[PDB]
């Protein structure tokens, strides 16, 4: 009954057990599906039992459950905004206590989801854009992050900073969703500066590593991104196969740009066979097959956001093609016109001797080719030993 629910809420608040209160607020609990708890105006009973601001929060929670029962997610989002604000006031009221951290996990995480629903319930009416509710939820999450991070004087085992990374991830899940980056810089700086960086929970660390690895990949930092995405993929939960596939989607181009090629079994296992041809072409120095494969799955790569990143494999393809030319001719003094013929066989548009020389000069400078160019003889003289050093050492 409602009286039993309110008494249980009061006892949980008095006993200061975060898990029980979080369950009594979270929608994951079956009590939201309980028909008798859903009410339209239960604030009178909440006022009698619960002391402020908890009474307002739980009245808003009951109203939110009633609204969700009717599939009115705009009212649910407004009620959940009231939830977040009331709980933030209550949480700030606490001093040197972090027992209410799981409640913040139950409340804030529930807000964002509702925003999505509200968002996809506002496209139908056409009275709002895509992401306004997400922006409001991001503002609420920023308030929560401020409350958690401002507590720098409490004990190690009694601080609210344990709730930082979680909130950061939530903000990430909005920033990438509404395509609004560059707000991740303060969050990354705060997480790096924090001494609890390696002490957060494994799930939050994996999520943070995945998002920061994506951001570093888009910043052409293919070593930091490689490290972050490797950590995320290695420690991802076995049950969440979708998360492993999503991490691997961005881990593959970074690893291939560093000279590592995924096996066919890996692509088959995680249903990423779109890369299967690409990994082959870069292995064979086949520019034509690489272009055809990137065009065949262009929609998938643009959807993932790695198509133009995958276009950067052209340098490794050039290196492999020139290595194949060197192995076919079996001489250390290779005429540049041989490389021109090889490039024309790959149907490179507007390719001539000047562009071949430019490509070879860049490969030599970056260390991919251990040789020099003789302009008088128009040849390439490579090292007799180790002419093409492995890409892992470049």
């Amino acid at each position: 009954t409602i009286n039993q629910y309110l008494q249980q809420v009061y006892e949980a608040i008095d006993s200061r057990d975060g898990a029980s209160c979080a369950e009594l607020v979270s929608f994951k609990h079956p009590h939201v599906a309980n028909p008798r708890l859903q009410m339209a105006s239960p604030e009178e009973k909440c006022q009698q039992v619960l002391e402020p601001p908890y009474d307002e929060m739980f009245a808003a929670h009951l109203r939110c459950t009633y609204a969700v029962g009717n599939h009115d997610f705009i009212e649910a989002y407004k009620c959940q905004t009231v939830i977040v604000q009331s709980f933030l006031r209550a949480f700030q009221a606490h001093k040197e206590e972090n027992w209410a951290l799981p409640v913040m996990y139950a409340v804030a995480l529930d807000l964002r989801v509702f925003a999505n629903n509200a968002d996809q319930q506002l496209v139908k009416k056409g009275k709002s854009k895509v992401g306004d509710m997400l922006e409001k939820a991001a503002e609420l999450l920023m308030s929560c992050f401020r409350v958690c991070a401002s507590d720098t004087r409490a004990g190690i085992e009694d601080s609210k900073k344990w709730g930082m990374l979680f909130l950061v991830n939530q903000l990430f899940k909005i920033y990438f969703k509404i395509n609004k980056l560059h707000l991740c810089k303060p969050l990354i700086r705060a997480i790096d500066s924090s001494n609890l960086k390696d002490d957060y929970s494994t799930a939050q660390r994996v999520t943070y590593k995945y998002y920061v690895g994506r951001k570093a990949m888009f910043d052409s930092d293919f070593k930091q991104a490689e490290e972050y995405l490797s950590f995320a993929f290695e420690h991802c939960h076995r049950s969440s196969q979708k998360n492993k596939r999503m991490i691997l989607i961005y881990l593959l181009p970074v690893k291939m740009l560093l000279g590592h090629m995924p096996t066919v079994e890996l692509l088959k296992k995680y249903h990423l066979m779109q890369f299967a041809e690409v990994t082959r072409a870069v292995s064979e120095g086949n520019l034509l097959l690489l272009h055809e494969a990137l065009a065949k799955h262009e929609a998938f790569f643009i959807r993932c956001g790695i198509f133009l990143i995958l276009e950067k494999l052209k340098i490794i393809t050039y290196r492999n093609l020139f290595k194949k030319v060197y192995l076919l001719l079996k001489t250390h003094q290779l005429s540049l016109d041989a490389f021109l013929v090889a490039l024309k066989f790959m149907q490179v548009e507007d390719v001539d001797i000047d562009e071949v020389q430019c490509i070879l000069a860049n490969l030599i400078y970056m260390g991919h080719v251990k040789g020099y160019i003789s302009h008088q003889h128009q040849k390439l003289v490579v090292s007799k030993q180790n002419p093409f050093p492995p890409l892992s050492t470049v």
């Binding site: 895509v130 990143i309 562009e355 000069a361 302009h375």
Partner: protein, 379 residues
């Protein structure tokens, strides 16, 4: 004119004292401009009294103000800006007329210094964009006006590059280009979400990419475009330029420069020094067998590949990096190459100038010029 200016100031003071403040968000009232002139009367008289006119806004041969020629000035407001009154803002038709006047009567003037011309046009386009922003204008016509502002700034990014710092600051011009492109992107997204599509978007998105060739993140943004915009020829050219620059493919980069439009070439001119320095580093490392001996490389190859005006400019570029040039053969030496300290002065490329086959007004307008507006303001 001082008495008229003070009377207009008193009128505005009374009208603003009638204005209310401290309103709720839902009760907000967006501003609707009512100025039928290119410049407000009060601002005209104010700048006439204070002797702050540009050369274009005065009657020739005197310091008196040709009111039909004066254009509203950007002034950054202040903490005491006192809000814009309705008659201090020009509506969208008046803004379009002002932009037409700028592109038809001012952007081709030859008399007067380059500094005065650039300052006048830049400040007046800033004023137009401020009037657009304060009125919450989001329409294809406003998009066109901001597009013309962006085109003017893109042209000046190369036309004025040889001027002294007191005449043209490259950093400020680049910032203005970036702000104009940001406004254009915001309005494009708003109109697309509202069900309206802009014909010229595919052009300026490309400019955006050409303005962010050193920022990898732009790639992500390029993959977020509408399929019509992303598959357009302009965006394809911009992505090709990005790939050429980031892969240090200077031959391909300058081939793209040769086969580019005037504004695309003007945007690509910003990376000439960087790409040439990287190219010289790569060539010096790749054409030298040992650090102790030098190798002769044809100067004609350097001129052709790096798109230099003639042998003299290439010789100066090579000498500024410590390499000896003689008999049309630069002696590439691995131990003699050195990157100079302090950026060298930039000069306009002849090819980009040759690409300008029409007037500046037509390039900024994006097409044939509209008829010159004729509007004598009412006292």
């Amino acid at each position: 004119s001082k008495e008229k200016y003070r009377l207009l100031d008193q009128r505005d003071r009374i009208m603003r004292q009638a204005r209310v403040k401290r309103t709720d968000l839902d009760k907000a009232r967006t501003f609707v401009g009512t100025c039928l002139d290119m410049c407000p009367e009060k601002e005209r008289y104010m700048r006439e009294t204070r002797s702050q006119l540009s050369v274009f806004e005065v009657v020739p041969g005197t310091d008196q103000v040709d009111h039909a020629a004066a254009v509203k000035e950007y002034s950054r407001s202040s903490a005491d800006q006192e809000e814009p009154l309705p008659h201090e803002l020009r509506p969208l038709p008046v803004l379009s007329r002002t932009m037409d006047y700028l592109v038809t009567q001012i952007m081709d003037q030859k008399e007067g210094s380059l500094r005065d011309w650039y300052d006048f046009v830049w400040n007046r386009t800033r004023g137009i964009r401020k009037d657009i922003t304060q009125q919450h204008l989001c329409d294809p016509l406003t998009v066109s006006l901001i597009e013309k502002c962006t085109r003017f700034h893109i042209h000046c990014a190369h036309f004025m590059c040889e001027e002294p710092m007191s005449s043209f600051d490259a950093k400020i011009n680049n910032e203005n280009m970036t702000k104009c492109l940001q406004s254009l992107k915001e309005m494009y997204q708003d109109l697309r979400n509202k069900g309206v599509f802009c014909a010229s978007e595919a052009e300026f998105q490309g400019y955006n990419v050409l303005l962010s060739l050193n920022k990898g993140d732009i790639l992500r943004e390029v993959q977020q475009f509408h399929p019509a915009v992303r598959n357009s020829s302009e965006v394809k050219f911009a992505v090709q330029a990005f790939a050429a620059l980031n892969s240090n493919n200077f031959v391909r980069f300058f081939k793209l420069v040769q086969s580019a439009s005037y504004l695309n070439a003007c945007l690509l001119h910003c990376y000439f020094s960087q790409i040439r320095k990287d190219a010289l580093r790569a060539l010096n490392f790749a054409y030298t067998v040992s650090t102790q001996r030098s190798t002769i490389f044809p100067l004609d190859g350097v001129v052709r590949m790096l798109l230099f005006r003639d042998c003299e400019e290439a010789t100066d570029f090579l000498t500024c990096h410590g390499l000896t040039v003689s008999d049309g053969c630069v002696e590439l030496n691995r131990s003699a190459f050195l990157e100079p300290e302090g950026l060298s002065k930039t000069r306009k490329s002849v090819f980009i100038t040759r690409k300008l086959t029409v007037s500046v007004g037509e390039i900024v307008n994006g097409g044939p010029l509209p008829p010159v507006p004729r509007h004598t303001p009412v006292c």
